[PDB]
């Protein structure tokens, strides 16, 4: 249900075993857990300028 647009790179984030989302400075989701493999995936929005 979390909708977004970006590149799904490897996060290198140490989530606690209950945690599902990662936030850094705002309401953006910086890192997200894979629902199937439980791999922690980064959310970086696509390149812009």
């Amino acid at each position: 249900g979390l909708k977004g647009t970006g590149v799904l790179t490897e996060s290198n984030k140490k989530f606690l075993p209950f945690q599902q989302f990662g936030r850094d400075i705002a309401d953006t989701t910086d890192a997200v857990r894979d629902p199937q493999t439980l791999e922690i995936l980064d959310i970086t929005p696509c390149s812009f300028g």
Partner: protein, 35 residues
């Protein structure tokens, strides 16, 4: 010995570390230094 506290609606500033662990907190309605 067992301890019973009670919960209040209260604002905190939580110190997350680099590992995602909450290491410290400020009770924002404790004393005016905390405000």
């Amino acid at each position: 010995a067992y301890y019973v506290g009670y919960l209040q609606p209260r604002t905190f500033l939580l110190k997350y570390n680099e590992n995602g662990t909450i290491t410290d907190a400020v009770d924002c309605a404790l004393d005016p230094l905390s405000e």
